[model samples]
Target: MQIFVKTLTGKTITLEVEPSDTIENVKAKIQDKEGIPPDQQRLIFAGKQLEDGRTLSDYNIQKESTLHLVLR
Candidate 1:
């Protein structure tokens, strides 16, 4: 699935990921693309913080949904 993410810097990124992929994995991908370390990245969706151990489907994330990314 493909999803959209918005960084604190107002940059929007597009990601190609699996619904079962871990949030940590997503963070790593983001780190590679955006140069932000995974540990320093915080992900938010639907007004709630996303956990590294959780899968995208666990949070009911759908394609085209916007997620927020912030530096910790």
Candidate 2:
């Protein structure tokens, strides 16, 4: 599935991921694409914070879902 990620600065990036992928997996990709470390990233989707321990599907993340990425 493809997901949209928006940074605090209004920068956006699209990521291709699997439903079975964990939030941590997404974070790693973000780190590669955005240059933000996984530990410094906070991901939110559907008004809920995404936990590294959870899968994308666990949060009901759908294709084209916009996930806000904040740096900590």
Candidate 3:
């Protein structure tokens, strides 16, 4: 599945992750690319904070779904 992940600083990136990927895993990827600490990253999807241990499937993020992130 392809997901769109964007940071508050205007860095928009796309990833092809499995449906089973968790938000924390995505955060780690973003942190690696943007040089932001994982602890300082927040995943916001549909205007709400995503639970850390939840997977994309758990959150109902299907293929082609988009998610947003903010570095706080």
How high is the CA lDDT of each candidate model?
Answer: 0.90, 0.91, 0.81
Which lDDT tens digits does candidate 1 get at residues 1-72? 999888888899899999999999999989888898887888999988999999999999988888998665
**Top-scoring candidate (TM-score):** 2
Backbone clash total, candidate 2: 0
* Predictions: Cα RMSD each: 1.2, 1.2, 1.6
| Prediction 3 global C-alpha lDDT | 0.81
Lowest summed lDDT across 10 adjacent residues in model 1 is found at 63-72
Global lDDT for candidate 1? 0.90
Models 1 onward score TM values of: 0.93, 0.94, 0.85
Cα lDDT tens digits for candidate 2, 1-72: 999999889899999999999999999999989899888899989779899999999999989889998654
lDDT of 3 by residue, 1-72 (tens): 988888786778888788788888888888777887888888887776888788988888878777877655
Q: Which 10 consecutive residues of model 2 have the lowest summed lDDT? A: 63-72
- As for model 3, its CA RMSD to the true structure in angstroms is 1.6
> Arrange candidates by lDDT, highest first: which order?
2, 1, 3
